[PDB]
Symmetry: D3
Subunit: 325 residues, 6 copies
């Protein structure tokens, strides 16, 4: 067999495929957010009995999509400064909020960390505590989250997740020790696709950290790789042979490329050139359309792990320099 | 690597592991069926335009779990006889009702065939048209159907599927040309596990055809094989390390072995001794506890395909002799 | 690894590679057929005791290559019409005629169905009952049928199969209830390659159904995919490093592309764009050279399963419309 | 997945499963050999132009099964001794006689080497030049040689190979520089199963070298491993679900374990305890029933490669001691 | 294929296979430690520039095997307490000390953390900075560390690693804020096997954390699994067919089962019943022979990940109770 | 999955990628060889008691890199001619000199054969007896030999191997029955890469046999294939994300393409076009830059086995014609 390869790096850097979105993309999202804003946010922070000594940990509950109650953690490092910067952290596919001690990186660097639990997931590599609540009937689907409600953008799973995620920034901003001028939205892989949505839809985010982003350039992802989770879509289309146009129409409303074209905040991206889960052409498509000030860290030899702890160093340096003005 | 192997056949034939079920197993199912019976069945058969010439095809809708509307097909062979025997057909994992022409076997053999669509699935190997409707919140789960609602038997996905399947036999029986003395429940793999449940829960079924059954002896299945779909449960338990006792309690209410101990109608089973999706020990555990008159066809060299078209011949000969 | 991909669709639709055949291609086939016609067809249809109720089943025996007796099934739906249309069904690799109840589709749609057993196979996924009878010595070969007798077109396995298949249509035509104006030849995968040969060699076929055809564009197939059964040819060539020119000369006489260029009857093809057993470039090469009226159904997300039950629907609609003209 | 393991070594050393053969096993082989002996052997040795300098190479042709003409190589080391000992070398599955320079080991150790080409193979890992000639119709079969004619011992492929192989020893013995008191029959894997047959059927062989033998204890092999080529039999049985008894009856006539029970010449065996192509329980079954003086070299950590060049050293030493 | 399974749990709980060690096992280790103690430990702690805010990070250097200079990190949480408890952390196969921010768990829980870099590794999943120094010639070996110097225990790779690890505890104990009554040795997988050796050889360790231990019951490991790294041994033995007795003789001196029989400090073990890297029978053999006060957490459905974050919670609670006395 | 494919043959035939070497490449090698030449070669040939009858077998010892003692075999066929031609044979990755009877081909063809043992390997498919002796510290590395000392060309493993190999030709030339006008350097795979280095560095070699060469065009190899052993370099780079430039700078001094540009003796190459261990583009890059008289045998359907026994025949014929003048 042939080892994975995408477009050459010189082509990746110029890759700007034709965008496809419906004319009501913005109106869809405006209505979605307006509907959810009719419910009070009702943020709840409850301090936990914990063995943690350098951080205070809080159980979080807030109202996400249509008032539905989403879990999280808030880790506050024990420091003298009265207002601290904050990272809102979104989680990779099949993960959930786990335990507070699973998210010590940002607090150790002096940042408040808001970890948003992902509705209905939390059963693959880290446990979760938040259910999904569907729009009535749960249509035929392929196992997983990628095709859950895919026949209509109004019923699609990521409509609810992205709305949760925009509301999570509001919930973080409500914590009294959070410096609202230094709120960062962050994620890798599904988390990066969520953060990319939030960068276009939120008014409160001040910077984006976007690693090896998933949920980008769907039509290309499906043709390029046979890995999960993009293969969920392919397997659905293999069966539902009459639904191709509808499937990609729905997905157009949730595509990171279309959000990137609307985002204005400063962003640090990362990409692995041998990543066969989130292919480099899908990541570069999103990066290249990203409309805010931007940088990308390129890891030529890395698969889905990306830059690992090297990239974490880059992120801390990037934010320090940004927030010095 | 090591080739798949289960217990030797001589051990499989005596394999009767200790059963685990809760005290309220029967009460759970009695309440479930009573609550769904409060909605009218409202079976609808709508003759469709079709290119089929030897068969009349109907679009089916009936009320399953809690009045929720389930799709299916009814295929009636064009024959002179006024009352015909009927097979109620349940579908394998990730399948759905597909097209009428996907179910030509039983009609061709002179049987009315009622194909029940599987709620929420239909996206893997044959398309489906029936949604699931959850009991409120859809809890954290691993991709698929095996762990959907698994923390409480009341919320568990197969509660709804098994209720649909019991109601499907009532729907079939309400068709005027069906001979109610010759209603057969049939399935292979997930369909076999569904049919095994129906064999204990239904009052209308007269015979069971149970091929290579899934949804049997969960605790053993999860230790034995790393194949999907049983690995969905294993993967959930890898993450939710605190939920093991709860998971297996819930599953006990849906285990084919526990239904088999309650079933009284005549049954023909099949098993593939090299089946690593539905291991022979889980299938023999169910067969060995099956409380009605029973036979099993054993296919020593077959994987999940079982007896294939050979077993289809065994089934037709079995039912002919039974109903004489 | 890399996920399978062939030429882009826009290139596939224009793909007309240079054809290679010997100057005696037609003479080879004329002599082959003339030599087999010297034996009487002697078609025998024997009614069977069956549990089937909507269809009458017949055990079939007829003379194929050089008078050799080939088995089949004939399924006749119980309908009032005195002359019925007929599908001659060829079978995929490692399959055979199985049981009569394995072929209920076409009879259920009102067609007589003649299923031809495949000589010497019948041991992979459906049982068969017909032997092969070689031209004397059985030369060194790689396991399978693809290299059986490959050093000479006169000894090659598919010379015998394709002659059996041309005689199968004569056998079907001899059944009294068959409408000879509505004889269809049909197959998928090896069956599709057999059917493609018959479309060029038979005088009795009126329409072709050709799904995901095997036995097409061998030189491309062997360099594109490492899957069986094309890999049998590759494996033979890895060992018999002196026989490359002879192997591809022999295969030129049996290539679906060379038959397609001679076929004049109306045809419906199908192709799976992710099919790595019968690659889309080999299928499109045959489709593009096909010299009769033609259509193709394209399944972008399907592998070797092709259009499945969706394509069955297309085939029934195609034939209904054709035979109403 | 799980890593391959067979019976523990202590159990392997005592493993003597019940043997199955038909009452006419000996008569079947007596009648097969007598029929082929009615054609003259007509051994032809044709010196070749070669770049080889330490060895003389001959193109061999002789009559095997029913007078059919089998190819081979004869390699004679250029030594002063007027009569030399001889190794008759059988080849592994999908191999053939290749080139003369592929068989330099035994000649370099001072032995004449007769390499028998394998009918109809020669297309996997080493080229071959000898065709098969079937007993009329070539029945339905799974790809390969293991199920070619398997529905009748008289049509089965290995009937013709084993007969060739017995005649190969007669052909080698006819070469004037061969010392007939020091004729060795040798093989690994398919070669070893061939050699094991020849050790029971030939009158001319004086010693057996049998490495990691294939064609042994078929019923166990098929249940134990899913590797090729034993899997060819399994796959044929998955489809021809009515032919199980007939398949194993045929195979009984060709099983190394039944030949081993009849062999009287001295033998050196080898076995790899992690061999998942020729499992150690099938090899030990044949070794344990072997009726002549015998030794086995056991390689606990090796797969199908066995003892490799270490074993080759064992074989040279074994034969030197034996022929002193 | 067959999914991985070891002995049933009820058998695992009683599994005490016969131990094999040479008569000079203790003398070998006494001599090894005495020889390395002749070089000064010369521990160096160098406060480094870091973006970490809740922790003080130190570059560590100390003398391990025969005076050779080994790297590490020391992470000290910023807390008012003047003496703190300490975890000496050993690293999994193909890993190294990485960056200080890779080891935030224990400091966040109020423990000083001493992370020992692994000589010659650090190139698989986390970077390292410490070379190996062989005893003269580097004999023929299979790729990796398992068979490096395996023909003599005096030249074997893990002789040098285990001596470094015993000296790492002495280096940690020399830090003035370390409470010497609360020094813990900890590791998972290779780290667990190192920690197990240290639990027998060190005089300063007060508690052992030993997760999914590697380097245990080699003869069984090599029989049971075909995974790396145990398969490095098998692959060496496949080639060096004359060296079986020598290989297992050497390995006996480094076997966690033989150290466990000598260890007296309180321990918490963990085991995954589906672990095919470190099989449960090799782990239970070590646990069952462990001579100090002991508990084991059993994870029936987990592979080599073990208890993950659940086990981390178990470790924190275990130590808190132990050191309350 | 996608089956392996490299550039089309017509492109391979013209493939001359831009070469990268440091401006001290020649000076590095001149100094390396001069430093090793300060130690006496001290060749030792000791006749063995052997069961071989057509060949005399000698145990060889000679001084390779910096006086270090390297093992080998010398096989002398028993012929009347007083001086014989000689093949110096280098060995594939994870192999060693094995037993004398493993190398009977060249002696049987009337050539003396000098088999050089490969330092530190000999544990994968054929046993070896020669250790490595590192330049002091053995830095962090990935399992295997490709990354051993890779951070500095002075410490790199192949500096020592290539020096041994140049000295092996001198050792061979010292045997009294060797005709020094007919000394051939030969290898496949790692052996071919070693031989290619020797063809530029040795003054005594008269012809090169170079099959499916490894150690060629590293930057391309690492992008193209995910197979071992080239993946050892990729794996090292995935972790040491800061060391890319250094790694490829080191490797430039050991790249077969750069030696090929300097080699002047006649050469026979071979290449398998389906070889995914040594890709055809890396082999053709070296062949195309080869500066001496050259021929290549192309095996379009072979993987890493190349031309096998067919190529052995090509080699014997090639050398016969060459040495006839
Ligand atoms: Ca708009
Ligand atoms: Ca009760
Ligand atoms: Ca309708
Ligand atoms: Ca012509
Ligand atoms: Ca007898
Ligand atoms: Ca002692
Ligand atoms: Ca420092
Ligand atoms: Ca220079």
């Amino acid at each position: 067999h042939m080892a994975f390869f995408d477009l050459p790096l010189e082509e990746l850097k110029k890759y700007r495929p034709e965008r496809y979105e419906e004319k009501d993309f913005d109106e869809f999202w405006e209505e979605t957010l307006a509907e959810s804003e009719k419910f009070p946010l009702d943020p709840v922070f409850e301090r936990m009995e914990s063995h943690l000594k350098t951080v205070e940990a809080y159980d979080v509950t807030f109202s996400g999509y249509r008032g539905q109650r989403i879990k999280g953690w808030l880790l506050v490092p024990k420091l003298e400064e009265e207002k601290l910067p904050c990272v809102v952290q979104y989680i990779g596919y099949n993960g959930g909020r786990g335990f507070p001690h699973d998210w010590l990186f940002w607090p150790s660097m002096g940042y408040i960390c808001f970890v948003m639990d992902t509705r209905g997931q939390g059963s693959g590599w880290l446990k979760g505590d938040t259910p999904d609540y569907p729009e009535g009937p749960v249509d035929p689907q392929y196992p997983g989250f990628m095709t859950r409600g895919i026949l209509d953008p109004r019923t699609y799973y990521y409509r609810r997740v992205f709305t949760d995620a925009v509301r999570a920034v509001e919930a973080a901003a409500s914590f009294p020790q959070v410096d609202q001028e230094r709120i960062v939205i962050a994620g890798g892989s599904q988390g990066g696709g969520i953060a990319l949505a939030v960068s276009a839809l939120s008014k409160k985010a001040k910077a984006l950290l976007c690693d090896v982003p998933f949920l980008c350039h769907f039509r290309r992802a499906v043709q390029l790789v046979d890995t999960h989770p993009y293969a969920e879509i392919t397997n659905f289309l293999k069966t539902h042979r009459d639904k191709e146009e509808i499937v990609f129409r729905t997905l157009s409303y949730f595509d990171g490329v279309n959000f990137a074209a609307r985002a204005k905040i400063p962003a640090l991206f990362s990409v692995g050139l041998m990543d066969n889960i989130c292919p480099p052409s899908t990541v570069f498509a999103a990066y290249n359309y990203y409309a805010g000030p931007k940088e990308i860290r390129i890891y030529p030899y890395n698969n889905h792990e990306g830059g690992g702890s090297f990239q974490a160093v880059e992120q801390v340096k990037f934010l320090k320099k940004l927030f010095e003005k």
